[PDB]
Amino acid sequence: AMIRKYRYGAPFDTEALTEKIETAEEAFPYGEISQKEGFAFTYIMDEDDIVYGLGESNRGINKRGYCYISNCTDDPIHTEDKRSLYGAHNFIIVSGKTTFGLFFDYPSKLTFDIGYTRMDTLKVSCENADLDIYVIEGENAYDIVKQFRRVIGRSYIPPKFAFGFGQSRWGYTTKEDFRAVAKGYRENHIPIDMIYMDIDYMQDFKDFTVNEKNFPDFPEFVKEMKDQELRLIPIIDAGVKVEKGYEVYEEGVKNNYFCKREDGSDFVAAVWPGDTHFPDMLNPEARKWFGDKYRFLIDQGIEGFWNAMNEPAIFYSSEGLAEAKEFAGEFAKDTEGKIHPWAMQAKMKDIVNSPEDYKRFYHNVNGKKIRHDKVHNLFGYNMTRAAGEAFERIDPEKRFLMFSRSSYIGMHRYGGIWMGDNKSWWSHILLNLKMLPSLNMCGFMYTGADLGGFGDDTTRDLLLRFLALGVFTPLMRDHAAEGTREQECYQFENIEDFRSVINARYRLVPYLYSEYMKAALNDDMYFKPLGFVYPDDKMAIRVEDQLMLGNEIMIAPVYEQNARGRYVYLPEEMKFIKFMPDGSISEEVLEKGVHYVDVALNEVPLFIRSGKCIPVAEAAECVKDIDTENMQLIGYEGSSYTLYEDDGIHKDYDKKENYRVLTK
Amino acid sequence: AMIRKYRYGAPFDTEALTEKIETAEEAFPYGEISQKEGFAFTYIMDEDDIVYGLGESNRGINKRGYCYISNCTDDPIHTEDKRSLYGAHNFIIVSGKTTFGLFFDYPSKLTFDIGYTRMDTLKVSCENADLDIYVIEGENAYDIVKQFRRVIGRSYIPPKFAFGFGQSRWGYTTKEDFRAVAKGYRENHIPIDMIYMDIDYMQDFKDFTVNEKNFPDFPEFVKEMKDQELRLIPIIDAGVKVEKGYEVYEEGVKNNYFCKREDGSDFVAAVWPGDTHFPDMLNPEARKWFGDKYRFLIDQGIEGFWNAMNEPAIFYSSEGLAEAKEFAGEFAKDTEGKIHPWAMQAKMKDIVNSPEDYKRFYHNVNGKKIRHDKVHNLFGYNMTRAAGEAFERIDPEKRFLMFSRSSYIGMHRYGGIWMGDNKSWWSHILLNLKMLPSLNMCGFMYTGADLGGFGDDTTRDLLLRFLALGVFTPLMRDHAAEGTREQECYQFENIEDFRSVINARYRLVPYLYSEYMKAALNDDMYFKPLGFVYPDDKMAIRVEDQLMLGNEIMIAPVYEQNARGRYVYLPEEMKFIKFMPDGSISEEVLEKGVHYVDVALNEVPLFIRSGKCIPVAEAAECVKDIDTENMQLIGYEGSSYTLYEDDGIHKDYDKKENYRVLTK
Ligand SMILES: OC[C@H]1O[C@H](OC[C@H]2O[C@@H](O)[C@H](O)[C@@H](O)[C@@H]2O)[C@H](O)[C@@H](O)[C@@H]1O
Numbered sequence A, B: 001a002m003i004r005k006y007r008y009g010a011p012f013d014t015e016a017l018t019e020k021i022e023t024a025e026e027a028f029p030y031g032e033i034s035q036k037e038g039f040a041f042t043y044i045m046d047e048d049d050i051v052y053g054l055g056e057s058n059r060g061i062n063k064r065g066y067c068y069i070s071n072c073t074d075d076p077i078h079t080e081d082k083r084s085l086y087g088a089h090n091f092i093i094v095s096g097k098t099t100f101g102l103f104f105d106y107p108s109k110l111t112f113d114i115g116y117t118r119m120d121t122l123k124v125s126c127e128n129a130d131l132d133i134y135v136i137e138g139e140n141a142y143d144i145v146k147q148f149r150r151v152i153g154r155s156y157i158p159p160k161f162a163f164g165f166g167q168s169r170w171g172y173t174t175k176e177d178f179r180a181v182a183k184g185y186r187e188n189h190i191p192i193d194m195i196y197m198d199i200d201y202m203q204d205f206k207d208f209t210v211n212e213k214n215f216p217d218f219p220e221f222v223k224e225m226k227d228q229e230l231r232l233i234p235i236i237d238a239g240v241k242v243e244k245g246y247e248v249y250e251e252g253v254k255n256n257y258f259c260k261r262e263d264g265s266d267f268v269a270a271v272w273p274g275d276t277h278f279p280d281m282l283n284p285e286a287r288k289w290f291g292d293k294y295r296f297l298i299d300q301g302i303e304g305f306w307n308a309m310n311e312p313a314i315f316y317s318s319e320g321l322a323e324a325k326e327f328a329g330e331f332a333k334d335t336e337g338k339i340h341p342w343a344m345q346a347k348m349k350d351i352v353n354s355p356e357d358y359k360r361f362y363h364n365v366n367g368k369k370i371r372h373d374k375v376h377n378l379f380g381y382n383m384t385r386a387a388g389e390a391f392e393r394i395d396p397e398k399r400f401l402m403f404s405r406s407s408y409i410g411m412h413r414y415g416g417i418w419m420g421d422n423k424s425w426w427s428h429i430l431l432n433l434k435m436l437p438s439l440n441m442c443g444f445m446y447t448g449a450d451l452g453g454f455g456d457d458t459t460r461d462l463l464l465r466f467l468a469l470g471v472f473t474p475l476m477r478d479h480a481a482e483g484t485r486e487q488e489c490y491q492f493e494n495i496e497d498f499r500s501v502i503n504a505r506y507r508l509v510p511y512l513y514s515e516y517m518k519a520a521l522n523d524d525m526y527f528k529p530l531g532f533v534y535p536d537d538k539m540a541i542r543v544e545d546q547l548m549l550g551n552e553i554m555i556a557p558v559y560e561q562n563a564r565g566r567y568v569y570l571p572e573e574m575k576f577i578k579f580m581p582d583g584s585i586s587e588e589v590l591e592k593g594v595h596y597v598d599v600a601l602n603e604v605p606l607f608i609r610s611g612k613c614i615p616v617a618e619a620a621e622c623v624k625d626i627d628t629e630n631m632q633l634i635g636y637e638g639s640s641y642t643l644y645e646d647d648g649i650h651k652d653y654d655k656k657e658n659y660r661v662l663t664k
C-alpha cells in the first residue's frame, strides 16, 4: 500500500530490493511517462519543492538546479560541472505540497534532469524502457526514506575497531614505511586503529598476492602491527593481471570466470598491472571464486579490506591502444598540419574509461550473455557482494571491515563506500558533509571522505578542519595520492592540535558507534538533514551545511580557510559544545535562531539538543582501550540516553544486554 | 618618508611606479633577507596577522594558508590548488599588531609562500636577487594601500558607456548573429550598451582585419549597432598570423618588430591563426607600431577593445611540435609497452604554454637582448600599454574602453582586466567577489568576471546570481566559451527576472559611476574589505563574502545554489535595501550584528550605511537614456552625497561643475 512497483518492459534483476513488491496495474501516479525516445518520466515541480536523494552524487542536499547522470565513472576531479561520479543511487524524494519517493531500478545510464533545462521540470530518462519504478508514499520525506530503507535490506555493519581513526597513503611500500607510520602516531600519543595498505603491497599489482621481497613473513608483520592495536587494511582491485603462472589468472582463464568479448576471447583492460582481465562479477560462480580468494589474506590476520577501480576503471583496452597508436603514427608523419596536437591530445584522453570499451565485453549470467554497458552500474556492487558473501562462508560469526569506491543500491548490505578521489580543497569539506545524509537515504551509512584531500597538496589548517568533520563520519581516514605533500598528522608543527582533534573522535566513539548500531538495526539514518528533524520550520528545511546525528546532536563544521567561526541556525534551544585542546569541554546554552559561533582550528564543535544528553569517554589511543564504564554525560539535566554496546566483533545484535539507559 | 626602496643587484626597470623613491641604505626593516640561493624574504607572522593583496590571485581576501606564484599563466581551470593565474601583482600588506606593505618590483617568477610551508611563516622568493622592494609604513592597511595607489599612478578610467551591461560569446560570427543578440535584448527591454566581438570577426584570426565576406561595409554595421546604443567591442590577440601579403606580418618582419629566437629568426608560436609571431612588447618602437594599428578599428567607429592570449599564450612552438611528433612516432611503433599512453598524453600537455618555449625568444630592449622568461610578467602589461599610448596619440581627450587578461602592476594605468576564463560554478561567484578588493589595492579598478561562467554549462539561477553581483562590478559582462550552453539573458524562461536584475544596474549607474570617478581621481578604492572601513571590529576584519563600495554602501551577494537568503554581519546600523522585481525598492533598518537576510533570485540586495545616502535613477535601457536630473535618494534623512558627473566621453575631470551635493 505504501510502496508500489511499476514495471516497464523486461528489467534486468539487480537484486537491489530484498522485499518482493507486486507489479502495480494502474496508471503511473505522478507526472507523465513516455516511451517515444527510450524512457522518460516528466514531472512539473512546485516552486517550493525540495528534491532529496541520489546518494553519492554532485553538489548539494537539495538536488534542484543541475543534472546528475547515474553512470559509475572513475573521475578524480570533483568540480561542480561533473554529472557522474562513482555511485549510481537512483532514489529521489520530491518534498513539498505533494511529496513522494521514486526508486528507478535500472542498471545503466540514467539521467536526472532536475531543473537543469527548465527550473520547474524534473525529467528522468534512459535509453531502454526496461526498468522497475518504485513509488513510495508517506507523510513526509523522512517517512518515505525509512520505508525505502526497510525494503532494500539492513545496512552493512562494520566491526567496532573501524570506528577508530585510519591512516593511508598511495606509496607505503616497505615494512619501514608502515613502521614509520606506526611510530609517528604512537610515540606522539595520537590515537589510531588502522593503517591502509595501498597497491604497492602486492607482488607487481597482483590481486591476492603480497610482495615477497618486502614481506617474507607477512603473518609476523600483521601481528607486529596488531599487537599495537593497528589493523592493516589492504586494497583489492577489479583487474586481475594477465601473467603466465599466476594462479588467479590461470584459474579465471581455464574456468571462463572472466568478462569476454563477443567472440568469447578474454577481454583485456589495462590498469596498474598493465594488461588485466575483469572477473565476471555478474556470474554467480565467478563471484564465489573471486570472493573465496580473500581467504589468502584473512588467514594471515587481516580483518578488513577496501576495493578500488571497480567501475571498472580502464586506462585503455587493447583496441583503444591500437587506435591511439595508429593515430599517433599519422600525427607523427603529418607534414601538412592536418592533424593538430589538440586532436592527438583528445584521442589520448578518449581511450581512458571509454564508453566504447564498456560495449566491448559481456557478462555471462547463467549462460545468457549481456553486454556490459547495459548493466554497467552493477559491477562494483557485485564485486563488493563477492567479498561480503565470501566473508560469511569463511567466518560467519565475524564482522570484517569492507568498503568500495563504485556502488549501486543493494551494495549497502555488503560494504561501506568512501567518497573516492577528492582534493585538498576547502570546498571538498562541504562536499563531504553534503553527501552524508544522501548516502544514508540510500542505505550507505558507513561512509567518509579522504581527510585532508586525496589529490593535490593540503595545508595544516585544511587537514585540521577536515579531521574535525571526520570526527563524526563512521569512516574516518586520512588518505593521500602519490606525489602529494605528506599529510600524516605528524608531518606538521604543533602535533598536539592533531592529538586534540583525534582525541575528540575517540571520546565520542561509544556514542557514535551506539547511534550507528541503533540506526542500522532499525533501518534508520545516522546523519539526517535538518528538515527531517524539523519538518515545520521553513528555515530549517533549507539548511545545507549542518546535519543532525542520531536524535541527540547537530554538527556544523567550519569549511572556510582562515575562519575563526561560522554562522549556524538552531531550530531549537541547544548546548553549544566544544572539545578544547587542553582536554576540557566547553558548554554554552544557545536559544532557537541565528548565531555566530567561535570555533578555533584545534577545537571540535557540536550541539546537544534540548532535553537530550550524550556520553563522552576519557580519551584513549585505540578503540580496545576506551573506558565505557565511567563516561561523563553532557547535555541537559534530567535527560537520559540509551547506549547500545556489544563486543564489536561478532553478530549478536538482538540482546537486551546490548542496551543500557544512562541518566544525567 | 613612509615609503622606502631597497635595491638588490641590477633590477630590470618595469615602470610599475610613476613616483621616484630614493634607494634606502639602512638595514631592511622587517623580517630577514637572504641572498644565499637567489633571493628570499622571510617573516614570522603573529597568529592574528591578516595578509592582504596579490590582486588577481587565487583563493581569499586574507591570503594566509596557501602559496601564490606570480607567473602569468593561461590556465582556464581556476580550482583551489592553482598557484598561478593571469595576474602578477606583487603587492602584499601584513596587517596586525605590526603592519607594513611590501611591493616586490621584479618581472619574473616570484613565489609567495604565505603560511603554506609553516603556518606562521611568510616567505617570498625568486631565482635572482635583482629587484627593488618597497616598504610602505602606515597606521593601518587602508593607509598603506592609498600610499601605494599614489606612487603607481592614476588608474585607467573608462568611458561612461562601459558602465552599462555587455554581452559576448565565443561564436558570434555573422551580422545576423549580432542582430539576434541586439534583437534578443532590445525587444525584451533588457538594458544593454555593449556587444563584444570575439575572434571570429577577423579574417582568418588576423589582428587588425575584419572578415570582409561577413562584413562588406563594416563601418555601416558599426553605425547600425551604434544607432541602437550598442557599441561593438572587438578582441585583439598577442599573436600576429604568419602570412605572406598580410601587411601587419610583412611590416613586423621587415622592421624587426617581432620577438626573435637566439639566432635572430622570428620566433614562431601557434595560437588561433596557426603560426604567429609576437610583437616585441618591450621594444618602444614595436609598441608604437602595434598600438598604431588600432587606428584601423577606431576609424570605423569602434570605441573600445579587449586583449586576450597576452601571457603570451602558446598552443605550441615549431620546436615543441617537432618534439611531440618525434615522441608520437616512437609511441606508434612501440610493441613492447615501453612507452605508456600517459607519457604520450603528458608530452601533448607539456607543449602548451611551455616553460621551455618562454626561454626560446628574446625582447630587444633599447638595443639590449633579454631572454623572455627573465621579463615574462611584463608582456601583457606592455601589450595593453601599447594600446593605451596609441589612444593618447590618436585622440588624447577621448576615453576608450580597454581591458586585458594578463597584467602586472603598472598596466592599471592603461586598461582594466577581466578575471579570465572562469567557470559556471557557484564557487566562482565568490571567487569573482574576493578578487575585487585585492585588484583595487593594486590599481585595477575597472574589473569584473564572465557573468554566468565562461566555461562549462550554466543554469538560469546561477546566471541570475552572477548578474546580481555583476550589478556592482565596473565591468558587467555576460561572456561564454564555444560549445557551452547558450547564456544570453533571453535564452531562459521568465525573462522579466533578467530585466529586473539588469534594471538595478542601470538604476545604480549614476552612483556607481560617481564612486568610480571619485575613487579613480583620488587614488582611492572603489571596493574595500570590511576591515578597511571597520578596522577596530575583530568580527568585521574577517568577513570575506561582503565588501564595502565607496563610502556609502555594503554589498553581500548570494552565492549558494538554491539559497533564498544568506547570513550577513553588519558592523554598524544599515538600511537593508532590495531592488524588487516590480520596480519598487524595499527598505529595512537592521542594527549592528549578525542577521539572516532573505534575497530571492530576482532581487538585488545592498546595504546603505548609517548617516549615508545614494541617488537612484529610474530604469533605462542604455547609459545615454538615464535621467539623472531628479534622481530619488535612498538612505538616511539629513545625510548628503556628493555626485560626480561629466560628459562620460572626454577627460575634463577637474571641473567644479562635475560635483553636485545632494541632500536627503
Ligand atoms: O591504489 C591507488 C589509488 O587508486 C585509486 O585512485 C587511483 C587514481 O589515481 C589517479 O591519479 C587517476 O587520475 C584516477 O582516475 C584514479 O582512479 C583510489 O581511489 C585511491 O584511493 C588509491 O589510493
Ligand SMILES: OC[C@H]1O[C@@H](O)[C@H](O)[C@@H](O)[C@@H]1O
Residues within 6 Å of the ligand: B074, B075, B076, B308, B313, B421, B481
Ligand atoms: O580563452 C580561450 C581559452 O579557451 C580554452 O578552451 C583553453 O583551454 C584556454 O587555455 C584558452 O585560453
